[PDB]
Design a protein around this ligand. Structure first.
Ligand SMILES: Nc1ncnc2c1ncn2[C@@H]1O[C@H](COP(=O)(O)OP(=O)(O)OP(=O)(O)O)[C@@H](O)[C@H]1O
Ligand SMILES: Nc1ncnc2c1ncn2[C@@H]1O[C@H](COP(=O)(O)OP(=O)(O)OP(=O)(O)O)[C@@H](O)[C@H]1O
Ligand SMILES: Nc1ncnc2c1ncn2[C@@H]1O[C@H](COP(=O)(O)OP(=O)(O)OP(=O)(O)O)[C@@H](O)[C@H]1O
Ligand SMILES: [Mg+2]
Ligand SMILES: [Mg+2]
Ligand SMILES: [Mg+2]
Lengths: 257, 97, 13, 257, 257, 13
């Protein structure tokens, strides 16, 4: 059924070529050339994780016949309270190896062996604040002993964690700030969502004044609010047999936030 | 009557009263309780704000219904009327309290 | 009424 | 015997199809369609737990021969200080699996494995404020890595916990409020309790204004006060030979609260 | 020898069936029938503990051959700062079980297992203000998951503890107040003591105004003060060789308060 | 009648 097919699309997720994503990719390309460790910081749902995930796809594993894959960018999100063994498992299994039960020393040496040979240039650690203070020493040793740009991603909670050890803080000084959208940048982003993401049978004119007013105040410029508001508003309109996001439907969503 | 640049606006008397009320600072604490002069109070949204200081307005003639305000975006916003529990029935003046 | 609350558990398993 | 049977019945529990229940069910159906995480917030004894129980019963598991059950809605009520293994324990046992002693990593991986393939679409965490702060990271990972709408249910004590972690606050920002009854809604509710819960040999006429005055005062419009007061008054009446609630025993009960 | 035997009796404890005891029992019987949770509140030394002990002793453990005992009423006094395992240990050891070393989760599951099967229907927690804030969640879960009337007992300290958790406050809000004695009840209570508790070989005439007026000022109507004064006054009078309490010893005692 | 604290404790057994 068409309605269920459109709902199955809209409840999904997609990556939009926003300028903030492009800005990060050029910055990460520079850090990868220089093998320079850094941090990416910004408020929640500004799109950092989507932008880093889009980066590893653009620099995906390169195959060579009978070799292990050449993998320029490794991306990991640690589990909560990530210790060193968990970090080593995260890295080794991203590189398509399987961990064998062993000591932390065995896990370390195998991770180092596969970070070499896979030719890893950059390791992005998303939600790096989940790392134990214990495991930051192994992160620093990867950056120092191998030629690898480690990129720590997080919110201001990461800066709080990083501040607790000068050796981490002083290695990860370089940062890029993600931020809230505003103005024409926010206006263009809403029109791009209507064009590229919602794809509704009739134009909703979401960049009209009375639409921009409620979208500006509900989202506060968070791209994650804008996406999830427009998803459910489209689901509601289509469920109602509308072919458009109507103003009242969008006001009903916006009051929930 | 002749020496006014413009006739004054007729002030909403509750707004005058609200800004005549004196005010104090206290923090919403565990369970949405807040202490003020030995009495304890709560209102319909208090506990969500437990852990930070709020601004609350009180009238010494009847402390039993406090009005409490959050500061957010560095602006004042009204939360709710905090009622003195068990005293939401008749007025209590501050002087005997 | 909707249901007996205990009867729902034996219905649900 | 009549008396022992009526007391054993009326000491019991039952669900009444209140408007607040239907309103939550329509809202939860939208969030389940959109896979949108959200929270349900309201004062104690407003009926949130009963309304969330009623929802999972409308959305019972679907049995398929030799498969594990398809379970669209999982409902859990964590114990106090719910750690991550406790949370994984709750979910796997709900899906009719037995946990095997092991690491947090084993519990996580097993939970994710069974949330997949049981086809879970929505996870309701009743009294989510009992979660430890470290446990919310694993709840966010369920919501983010899987297509599962997570619904946190609590009193405003939940919002005090949510605001302490920006990443939880920004994911669970959409909310529904449960409030006190009033006006016609309270009047029709007490009328339903007498019609369909008390089931006494004689009508009590609690709808009539001088009894409604007693109930409105004692209950403050909390449905849980309403239920407990009328059942206690009925059991007292039947124990003392009154074939209905009488205004005196009603006044006697109301005085204790 | 005479003196040691009557003194060894008089330094003991004894339970007098005050009307205050009967009104509690008739109230706890109604609450137990409804399985309704509630609290008993009142000033210190008003007899709340002795009346709850009297209620527990009327509702004895029933043996059945080779079964665990049917125990309708459990009574516990927590130690100070009672945590969850402390509560579970006290409940499970009131039923005739030993605790095994284990987690809080093991103690909980074993307690829930033995509160069932022992057929518990009322749990009295005397000095419930000794419970830690966290352990009230397990008390509420016992009252919610099993149909058990939980009875919290304490002074105004309990109302100060309860009101800081609205979920606890709204479950235990039905209450009974223990009062000071006064008037003809106080006169009637004094009359009972010398004939039902003291039973010195000669009448003490404690009802007489010159004695009754002093006892009023010294006890203020606290049943605990009334008992402890008269027991000590009898002991001291006997130790002087007197057959009875004289007002001179009664004044000699009453001046110590 | 009076209830002895000892008697009720022993009868409880
Ligand atoms: N480039 C994008 N294109 C489309 N949607 C996006 C994009 N970036 C973000 N979103 C939307 O915003 C949501 C949140 O983005 P994202 O997960 O990247 O945030 P984040 O900054 O990593 O957050 P947090 O710090 O809270 O973990 C996404 O799930 C998606 O709905
Ligand atoms: N729809 C209903 N039909 C019948 N009885 C109800 C209904 N909703 C609530 N009740 C009664 O009110 C009591 C309290 O409701 P419920 O447990 O759902 O509250 P709650 O909002 O989850 O409370 P809390 O936040 O304190 O845990 C129920 O246990 C039941 O006695
Ligand atoms: N019914 C009674 N018969 C005989 N003596 C009594 C009775 N009630 C109270 N007493 C006397 O009063 C004393 C105090 O009573 P009890 O321990 O029950 O008080 P309470 O209200 O529970 O006090 P607290 O709040 O201080 O713990 C008893 O130990 C006993 O000496
Ligand atoms: Mg992220
Ligand atoms: Mg509940
Ligand atoms: Mg006591």
């Amino acid at each position: 059924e068409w309605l269920q097919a459109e709902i199955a699309r809209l409840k999904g997720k997609s990556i939009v070529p926003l300028q903030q994503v492009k800005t990060l990719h050029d910055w990460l390309d520079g850090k990868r050339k220089a093998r320079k460790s850094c941090r990416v910081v910004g408020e929640s749902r500004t799109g950092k994780t989507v932008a880093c995930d889009a980066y590893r796809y653009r620099h995906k594993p390169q195959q060579e016949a009978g070799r292990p894959p050449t993998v320029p960018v490794v991306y990991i999100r640690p589990h909560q309270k990530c210790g060193p063994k968990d970090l080593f498992k995260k890295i080794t299994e991203y590189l398509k190896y399987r961990v064998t039960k062993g000591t932390v020393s065995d896990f370390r040496d195998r991770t180092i062996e596969v970070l070499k040979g896979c030719g890893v240039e950059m390791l992005i650690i998303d939600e790096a604040d989940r790392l134990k203070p214990e495991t930051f020493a192994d992160v620093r040793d990867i950056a120092e002993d191998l030629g690898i740009a480690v990129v720590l991603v997080g919110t201001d909670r990461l800066d709080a964690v990083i501040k607790r050890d000068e050796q981490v803080l002083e290695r990860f000084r370089a940062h890029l700030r993600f931020g809230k959208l505003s103005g024409e940048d926010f206006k263009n982003t809403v029109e791009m969502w209507e064009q590229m993401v919602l794809k509704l049978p009739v134009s909703s004119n979401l960049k009209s004044k009375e639409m921009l007013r409620i979208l500006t105040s509900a989202t506060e410029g968070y791209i994650g609010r804008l996406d999830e508001i427009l998803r459910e508003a489209a689901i509601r309109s289509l469920s109602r047999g509308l072919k458009k996001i109507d103003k009242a439907v969008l006001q009903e969503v916006a009051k929930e936030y | 009557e002749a020496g006014l640049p413009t006739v004054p606006v007729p002030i909403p008397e509750r707004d005058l009263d609200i800004c005549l009320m004196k005010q104090s600072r206290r923090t919403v604490q565990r369970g949405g309780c807040l202490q003020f002069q030995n009495l304890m109070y709560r209102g319909e949204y208090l506990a969500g704000y437990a852990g930070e200081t709020v601004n609350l307005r009180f009238d010494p003639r009847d402390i039993t219904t406090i009005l409490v305000y959050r500061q957010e975006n560095n602006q004042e916003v009204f939360l709710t009327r905090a009622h003195a529990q068990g005293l939401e029935t008749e007025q209590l003046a501050l002087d005997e309290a | 009424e909707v249901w007996d609350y205990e009867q729902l558990r034996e219905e649900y398993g």
